[PDB]
Design a protein around this ligand. Structure first.
Ligand SMILES: O=c1cnn([C@@H]2O[C@H](COP(=O)(O)O)[C@@H](O)[C@H]2O)c(=O)[nH]1
Ligand SMILES: O=c1cnn([C@@H]2O[C@H](COP(=O)(O)O)[C@@H](O)[C@H]2O)c(=O)[nH]1
Lengths: 257, 257
């Protein structure tokens, strides 16, 4: 169970997340990909009590600022009890990602509990991101490797996926799991990887740019620990609060089954 | 020759770049990866006369701004005659990259002549980026696919590289070439791909985070059209202006051979 995994997971970030999921009876991660901080904060407020994690793309915000975007996000995170996951998908050499994660305008390492990286770069990407994390904050940080993607024509399969899983094995305390479409095993080698799965929608089938959706029951059935839902919650005139409860209920019941 | 390829290339961006390389006798691309706009502008000024392209990571700048960073960069670009390449390495689903490329704080599509993307996502990444480019500006834009990386343990090989090359084949006018470590062929299929190669250094062997360097003569001999040099130009107390001429000379002579 999530509660049991919280006590045995080497990562304090994964542990806190598992506890949040148990306490709030939710394995839903909201991906409120809107372009203004104002709307983002309104949506986060509406989804707050129903999520365990908020996945953000701060780089699609036309008005990002540390004081106006990050501080309010941290306040909501504390108020409603959910972690912050900046979906930056780092994918450059170690030295460059260290610079991109630690500072710049977004100063991601300062506030995001979790972030992610593509395995394409090799082991150096993990080393670079961790060095950045330790140089900027004393707060625990977690990293997810991108093992698979939900988009049409994805190349994150076969040997590439295996190579990405190998990269993840280098740091059990820092690399907490994967963004993937199925279980990645690892139990046999002392790994308890969190499996977070995007490309989840109960209504949409996909979009005009390669996105593909699978149902909640479907992904949970293949090993997903957390469902990441974006447009299924807030787009096309949908009521985020209502969709939030709807998806939380579906994800939690699937987990219980 | 570069001059000949400028007349036959389907991309007006590649065409302009080839003409610049011929007129200035340079195939050097500077990667002045510093953290302040002030230092960046000083370095670009010093390298201007010796480069055909400026590769930037605006997301490592602690003080980025359209008026204070981009405007000056465009002015230097016009003053010294070189193009702008924002090395953002897009690697998300089509819908997300469209948003990340067209707006946010960096508004990359508004000023960068060239940008790049990882093939891991599938063909949707090219569609999303092109749609973003056309909705934001009428100026011609070019895209480079990341076929290979210079870092240790890179997974950008074999089947993954092939899949990335296939994605590039979808748009001859927009996808101008690759970031790669060797020739990618394509001539038999009617492609004249620009090969830009990072991980180039005449002195450094590598760094502490997986970077590996090859000499100018070595990469040009394997098919590189443009050499991308960062720390070899400005780091470790080096005199950027002097290194600029040194690398330009080396790259041009290797090309002439
Ligand atoms: O395999 C995938 C697919 N999508 N995403 C991200 O998850 C969200 C999916 O949103 P959607 O439900 O609106 O399609 C977007 O932010 C997208 O960048 C991933 O991280 N990986
Ligand atoms: O295969 C590679 C390796 N590095 N880079 C980028 O090129 C530059 C190389 O810089 P360096 O010469 O200082 O190592 C950096 O900006 C790095 O992000 C790439 O695009 N691809």
């Amino acid at each position: 169970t999530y509660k049991e995994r919280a006590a045995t997971h080497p990562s304090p970030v994964a542990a806190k997340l598992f506890n949040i999921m148990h306490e709030k009876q939710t394995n839903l991660c909201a991906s409120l990909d809107v372009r203004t901080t104002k709307e983002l904060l309104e949506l986060v407020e509406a989804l707050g009590p129903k999520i365990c994690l908020l996945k953000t793309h701060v780089d699609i915000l036309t008005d990002f600022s540390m004081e106006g975007t990050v501080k309010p996000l941290k306040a909501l995170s504390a108020k409603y009890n959910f972690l912050l996951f900046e979906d930056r998908k780092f994918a450059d050499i170690g030295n460059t990602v260290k610079l991109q994660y630690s500072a710049g305008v977004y100063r991601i390492a300062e506030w995001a509990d979790i972030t992610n990286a593509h395995g394409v770069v090799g082991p150096g990407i993990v080393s670079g991101l961790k060095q950045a994390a330790e140089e900027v904050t004393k707060e625990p940080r977690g990293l997810l490797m991108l093992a698979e993607l939900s988009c049409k024509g994805s190349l994150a399969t076969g040997e590439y996926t295996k190579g990405t899983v190998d990269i993840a094995k280098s740091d059990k305390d820092f690399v907490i799991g994967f963004i993937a479409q199925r279980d990645m095993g690892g139990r046999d080698e002392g790994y308890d990887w969190l499996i977070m799965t995007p490309g989840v929608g109960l209504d949409d089938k996909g979009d005009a740019l390669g996105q593909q959706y699978r149902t909640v029951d479907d992904v949970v059935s293949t090993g997903s620990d957390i469902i990441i839902v974006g447009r299924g919650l807030f787009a096309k005139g949908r009521d985020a609060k209502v969709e939030g409860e709807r998806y939380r209920k579906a994800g939690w019941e699937a987990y219980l089954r």
